[PDB]
Amino acid sequence: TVWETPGVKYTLECAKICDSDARCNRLTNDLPEGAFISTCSFNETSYRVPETEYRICPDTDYTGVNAKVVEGVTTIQACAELCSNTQDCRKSVFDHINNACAIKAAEPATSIFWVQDKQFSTIRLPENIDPAVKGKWGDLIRLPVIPVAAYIVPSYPEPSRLLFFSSWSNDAFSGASGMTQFGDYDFATGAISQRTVTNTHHDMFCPGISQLEDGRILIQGGSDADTVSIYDPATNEFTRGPNMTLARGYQTSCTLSNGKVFTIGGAFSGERVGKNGEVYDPVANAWTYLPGADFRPMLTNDHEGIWREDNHAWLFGWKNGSIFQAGPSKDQHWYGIQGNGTVAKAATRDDDDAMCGVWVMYDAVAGKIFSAGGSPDYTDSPATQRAHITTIGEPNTPAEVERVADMGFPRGFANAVVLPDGQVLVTGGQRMSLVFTNTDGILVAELFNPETREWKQMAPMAVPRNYHSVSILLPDATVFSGGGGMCWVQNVGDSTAGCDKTVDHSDGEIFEPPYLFNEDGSRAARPVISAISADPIKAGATLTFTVEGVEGQGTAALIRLGSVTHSVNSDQRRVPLNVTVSGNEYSATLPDDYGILLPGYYYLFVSTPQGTPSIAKTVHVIL
């Protein structure tokens, strides 16, 4: 049995005694001591000091740089007073065992985390966040598996499920194991399961991911460096693909105009040497090595050497089977699969590498690519505020790079999604790239508007999303930010007791952007796609669907479904549409070119002229 507090929980006379002493564990609350939080797990109190009002949350700490620590304070009340009497104090911590009052330092210059700890109590002056300007975050969704890699499951009438996976363990990784821990999350229902995927003899940690024409996910290399699994949404099963011609890890793959998948680099797993290109043909079910797809031009310069330098290429499938490589190498390049592969310089993005910077094609029709953040070395490297729009016209002809306004924060290991209005939301990352750390995690998301060419700071998330964190678009036009952490351990099935569990975030949180709210902070009225054919459509063809619940003519956009890991999302892409409406009936002529309309499963978003999007309808583009 479990004796709940007047919301704590032990597992009945010593219990009341134990819940007096802030040092007493041997306690069995929902989340354990150490757990990060979005909301007081316990019953909050209010408290005024002869002025103008603090909310207190017991058994919770605020971690981070303090403005002050004062040792002579025996009551939460006296701690409330030092905060009341200290300029720019939004957040203080009362230490129960030592009678000290910590004043937290100013946000967001400082990163402050809400952890669960019975030794402390948190005090704060309530924030007034207008979700019409800064969006709104929900509470931490706990998950059986750290979501180190994630992808939407293509489904009709719209997707409902987010698969994610880690390694052999739910919170740890080794080398070759032949098994992968997967999490299943229905976000239509909140249902959540995990499975163990051994049937393909594949530890899929550190892989290339690309969605095929038929919406199967192609999971390539990683801890088992030469091994390929294919996920069929149709079966919800995995299949063994043909081994790659060259074993790789931390590489990028991208689906091409013709539905072949190109990949290059991936020196993390297999031979510690740079990796030339290869291409998967799903019809022939065959990989073909591409020696002329030379790695050396796309090489970064890293203090750790070649191990790092060909990792996480900014690849895009483009016109007539071309590949654009936007980075993170200071120079951009065009890669092809013709003959034995090709490579040529396209432009210079910057004067330094941006390993694990963010990058998204926010307007395929206009050949437009947005890139921000990254660090010049993989780890132990200060991140950059620099950001660029890169415009690509014809393949194997120079590309145009315009530097734009610096981000508000330097971000290493951040993630990015394009939204239906074509704005790009950057989430997570840290001031200095340090693998397996919460250190200087930026909590404040930022929205970049390519039309304004201007940044805007969004509301803060709860948890630092650094290395092994992820971000992805959901059908409802919200963003899931999740994971971070994992522990290297020598052999498979070794104990994870020595691991720093504070860096692990086996969970996620969802952001509603500004566009989901009216000015009064109520949820704005989403257009509804009443009817759409589940029929696959081909490029150049005309999409017809029925929209109800809009004042004026809707705009529309297609956003290709997303796969994501290691600041790499090579499947997402925004294809803005021109619509013509006759009454409730909307009609769109899709582009002529599969280099813009990459084949696969898309989200159709109709959105109001004030910019409020529909829940999406699944749309399948075929060859």
> Which residues are marked as active site?
467
Known binding-site residues equal 250, 467-468, 566
Cβ atoms of residues 509 and 518 within 8 Å: no
Q: Are strands 537-538 and 617-622 parallel, antiparallel or unpaired?
A: parallel
How many residues are present in the chain?
Answer: 623
CA-closest candidate to residue 360, choices 195, 479, 188:
479
Torsion of CA 281, 210, 353, 270, to 10 degrees: -70
In angstroms, the CA 151 to CA 470 distance is 10
The DSSP code for 355 is B
Residue 15 parent element (H or E): helix 14-18
Q: Which residue type, as a one-letter code, is found at position 573?
A: R
In angstroms, the CA 513 to CA 316 distance is 26
Q: Please, what is the Cα angle at 173 between 172 and 176, to 5 degrees? A: 155
Start-to-end CA span in the chain (Å): 61
CA-closest candidate to residue 293, choices 329, 339, 249:
339
Q: Is-cis flag, bond preceding 126, omega within 30?
A: no
Give φ, ψ of 138 to 5 degrees. -95, 180
CA-closest candidate to residue 529, choices 420, 438, 400:
420
How is residue 553 written in tokens?
């003519």
CA-closest candidate to residue 512, choices 498, 528, 526:
526
In angstroms, the CA 462 to CA 453 distance is 27
Known binding-site residues for Cu(2+) equal 250, 467-468, 566
